[PDB]
């Protein structure tokens, strides 16, 4: 209840943490690279700060 109205905090669909998400950017945009394995690291619980690391293979190799 706020400002005289009724509000709900929706369930947000979120990417699982501490997992590698390998992505193929296959439609050739960003042609200088097609792969990226994203990893977001959660230290000890959903409240801690998460650090995202991105590992790429480039066309250069």
């Amino acid at each position: 209840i706020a400002r005289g109205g009724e509000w709900v905090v929706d369930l947000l669909e979120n990417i699982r943490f501490n997992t590698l998400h390998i992505h193929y950017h296959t439609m050739q945009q960003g042609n200088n690279e097609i792969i990226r394995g994203e990893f977001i690291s959660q230290p000890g619980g959903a409240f801690e700060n998460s650090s995202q690391i991105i590992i790429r293979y480039m066309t250069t190799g």
Binding site: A2, R3, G5, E6, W7, V8, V9, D10, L11, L12, E13, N14, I15, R16, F17, N18, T19, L20, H21, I22, H23, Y24, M27, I35, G37, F39, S41, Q42, P43, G44, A46, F47, E48, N49, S50, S51, I53, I55, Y57
Partner: protein, 170 residues
């Protein structure tokens, strides 16, 4: 590497750390001390977890290379094995965490701004069904991606209703 030309061949670790610091012995440690906290914190944030951090990073690179070798497909972006649903408790705490430092630590505004975040869904009381479905709704926030995320994924059955969705509009 056009950006890391000088240290591409360097074995002097201190030189690497120094060049990283300028791109971003006490200063040598600090830039290395900040690194392990921001690089795979879930493995640990102390100097005794560097070996396992490196092993895990090698494993991640190995998995990406396995995918590039067509040994494995790319991770399914719509499968629910790799998804999580967050509501109320998680969503407010992260917003409270961001709001706590800027309103308390940085210097009645935190209450107002938290409420403003709450407003920025409205509980529609069409019926009891509308209420308990609005609280049972999971929200995701012209390409193949747009097609694929709207489909009935094969991981849905039993967790996401295979029928319930909007019938009109985006």
């Amino acid at each position: 590497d056009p950006i890391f030309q000088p240290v591409q061949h360097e074995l002097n670790r201190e030189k690497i750390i120094q060049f990283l610091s300028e791109k971003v012995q006490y200063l040598n440690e600090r830039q290395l001390t900040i690194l392990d906290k921001i690089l795979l914190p879930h493995m640990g944030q102390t100097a005794d977890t560097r070996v396992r951090k490196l092993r895990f990073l090698g494993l991640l690179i190995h998995k990406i290379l396995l995918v590039i070798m067509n040994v494995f497909p790319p991770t399914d972006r719509d499968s629910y094995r790799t998804k999580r649903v967050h509501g109320s408790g998680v969503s407010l705490a992260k917003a409270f965490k961001a709001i706590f430092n800027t309103s308390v630590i940085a210097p009645s505004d935190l209450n107002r701004s938290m409420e403003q975040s709450i407003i920025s869904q409205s509980l529609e009381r069409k019926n009891l069904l509308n209420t308990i479905s609005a609280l049972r709704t999971v929200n995701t926030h012209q390409t193949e991606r747009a097609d694929m995320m709207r489909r009935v994924h094969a991981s849905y059955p039993g967790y996401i209703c295979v029928a319930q969705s909007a019938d009109t509009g985006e």
